[PDB]
Amino acid sequence: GSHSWRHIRAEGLDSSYTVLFGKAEADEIFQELEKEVEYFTGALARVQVFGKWHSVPRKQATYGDAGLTYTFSGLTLSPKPWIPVLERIRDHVSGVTGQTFNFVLINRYKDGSDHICEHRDDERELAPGSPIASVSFGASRDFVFRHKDSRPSRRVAVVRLPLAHGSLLMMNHPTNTHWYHSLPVRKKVLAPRVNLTFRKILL
DNA sequence: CTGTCTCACTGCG
DNA sequence: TCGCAGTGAGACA
Ligand SMILES: O=C(O)CCC(=O)C(=O)O
Ligand SMILES: [Mn+2]
């Protein structure tokens, strides 16, 4: 291991942040991701929330071992077979953390108008206690942690941090039980961002 | 006086 | 421009 982590801690919050790649390498990986990743469209890009169906305000893709599935918000996604650039990132993350992953959800935000609404990654197909590894390329975007009982008896402070080009954010147990997260709209950001959340899914 | 939950939106302020 | 409130159409437990 031996890595410079920034620990994000609060009640029920255990997250870690480090920069894995310098600019030249991260640029190279980003350009490969832009060339190689295939995103879902049409019916595989619509979610149901609060009884309404929506096209997702971004693009999504999934890769991982054969036989696995991932379902959230009325949407079931099937993994495409691994490709070199994603295996490079998975293996690097695995070496630095000691954790293994069999699945990745890729989110692409074309600019600051693309975003993701607040949620917990608490799905049943997720291995109990398993961490989620979030790797980011392209534009730096703000990421928000919010405590679930602040929306509002327990006015617990929100946690904000920018996720930089080439960075890794580890979300350990029980972060996803007690805290919601989101990438809010940032109208000033004009460049695209590609995010990878490596997960461990049960068969 | 009092059920829990929501990866999304519009309508505010 | 950003953040918050209330969803809304049910499915739960
Ligand atoms: O865009 C991000 O950095 C986070 C994406 C996310 O929340 C997820 O993959 O579940
Ligand atoms: Mn998430």
Burial of A9 (0-12, 13-18, 19+ CB in 10 A): exposed
Enclosing H/E stretch for A132: strand A132-138
Distances (CA, A) of A125 to A129, A146, A182, A188: 12, 23, 21, 36
Tokens of A81: 């077979």
Tokens of A87: 């295996």
DSSP 3-state of A164: coil
- Confirm whether any atom of chain C, the nucleic acid strand, is less than 7 Å from CB of A188: yes
Cα–Cα nearest to A13, from A123, A163, A169: A169
Shortest-distance nucleotide from A158 CA to C1': C3
Non-local CB neighbours of A10 within 8 Å, separated by 6+ positions: A145, A147, A156, A157, A159, A179
- Nucleotide with C1' nearest the A112 CA: C1
CA of A101 to C1' of B4 (A): 31
Token couple for A63: 């890769």
Return the closest-CA partner of residue A104 out of A115, A91, A117, A114. A91
Domain residue ranges in chain A: 1-203
Query: Nearest protein residue to C3's C1' (by CA)?
Result: A184
Q: Is A95 helix (H, G, I), strand (E, B) or coil?
A: helix
Location of structure tokens 């490709």: A83
Nearest to A198 by CA among A98, A64, A66, A72: A64
Resolution of the coordinates, Å: 2.5
**8-state DSSP, A154:** S
Q: Which atom of ligand 1 is nearest to the CA of A193?
A: 1
In the CATH hierarchy, which fold is given to the domain comprising A1-203?
A: Jelly Rolls (2.60.120)
